[PDB]
Write a protein that binds this ligand. Structure first.
Ligand SMILES: C[SH](C)CCC(=O)O
Length: 360
């Protein structure tokens, strides 16, 4: 019987299919099929409440591993029994480079939220910083920003000169500066960008939209996920990524309880093979996202140039390359799991106000 995996489409799903989905299906004799979504838990909640679950494995935001565990949607793993050791025998829990954010999480890759411009369209002046993203005088034009408050409030505060720490024990220090007053400042900063006659905002929802909007000249700068920009660059689109105030984030799979392949163990077998050392390394032959396992990272590094063409080195394109980390923010998933409802109410009220005061 087939196992249904849910992921984010475009270049990301392709990297998973080619790197580890199709190999897993062929090895195990369990078909592995892919469904596109755009994140969150609303679809799976609707399926579960209807008693009609068709999804088996979900590629999920870090915050959704926490929420989906707490809501009883996802299976709590017994990590070193359920996931495979590294080839040298290292248990999975010691091979994955840090701890899981929830008992329902297993890592796949790390990705960055950053931004890009089209070098052929932007003009002679070139954006270089997150402050430039907000600078409508030096760089007039529309911006594309993510549909949700998450990631936007962080970059708005850093563009306002509030300091992030990047990764350290206890998470990024930025989040302690995102109480009520900091949230209000971040909302005001975004509202200012989107209301400026020399700015304005397109809200993107799907990962393919930021590179497409830049390729077509619909915005002058767009936030997005670095692997989507990387894919467009490798296809010949003259985008340039800016890594100042990039947000380093961690992605996961979760196993849907009561999905079609849950009781018979088929979904778990697929998941263990997809998240193997070889599988996670294989995905990085296709897209610039870093494997979660130390063993997989070591394979990629030893095998450079690791890209599918046998000539492009992948390490300099990774979210974790030191050159790309110089001013990063580390995403805090507990913050968003805990506070997204309260924040989203204020965020959506801000977005509704953009329309209500908009004159055709
Ligand atoms: C899995 S999405 C949250 C980020 C990576 C991508 O889709 O390119």
């Amino acid at each position: 019987g087939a196992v249904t995996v849910v992921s984010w489409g475009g270049a990301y799903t392709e990297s998973q299919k080619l790197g580890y989905g199709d190999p897993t299906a062929a090895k195990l004799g369990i078909p592995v099929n892919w469904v596109d979504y755009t994140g969150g838990l609303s679809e799976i909640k609707a399926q579960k409440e209807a008693g009609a679950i068709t999804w088996d494995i979900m590629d999920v935001y870090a915050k959704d591993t926490i929420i989906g565990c707490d809501e009883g949607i996802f299976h709590e793993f017994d990590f070193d029994k359920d996931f495979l050791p590294a080839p040298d025998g290292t248990p999975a829990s010691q091979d994955f480079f840090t701890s899981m954010p929830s008992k329902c999480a297993v890592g796949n890759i790390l990705y960055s939220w950053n931004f890009a411009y089209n070098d052929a369209k932007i003009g002679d002046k070139k954006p270089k910083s997150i402050k430039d993203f907000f600078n409508t005088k030096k760089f007039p034009g529309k911006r594309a920003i993510y549909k949700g408050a998450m990631s936007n409030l962080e970059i708005a505060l850093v563009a306002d000169g509030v300091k992030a720490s990047g990764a350290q024990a206890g998470g990024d220090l930025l989040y302690r500066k995102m109480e009520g007053a900091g949230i209000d400042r971040a909302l005001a900063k975004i509202k200012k960008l989107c209301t400026d006659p020399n700015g304005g905002c397109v809200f993107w929802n799907a990962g393919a939209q930021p590179p497409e909007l830049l390729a077509n000249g619909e915005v002058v700068m767009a936030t997005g996920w670095n692997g989507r920009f990387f894919n467009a660059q490798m296809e010949g689109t003259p985008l340039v990524q800016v890594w100042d105030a990039q947000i380093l984030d961690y992605e996961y799979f979760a196993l849907v309880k009561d999905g079609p392949g849950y009781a018979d163990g088929s979904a778990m077998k697929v998941l263990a093979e997809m998240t193997s050392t070889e599988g996670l390394a294989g995905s990085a032959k296709y897209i610039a996202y870093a494997p979660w396992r130390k063993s997989s990272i070591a394979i990629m590094e030893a095998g450079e140039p690791w890209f599918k063409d046998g000539k492009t080195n992948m390490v300099p394109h990774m979210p974790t390359a030191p050159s790309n980390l110089k001013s990063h923010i580390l995403m805090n998933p507990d913050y968003w799991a805990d506070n997204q409802d309260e924040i989203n109410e204020k965020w959506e009220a801000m977005k509704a106000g953009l329309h209500h005061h908009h004159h055709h």
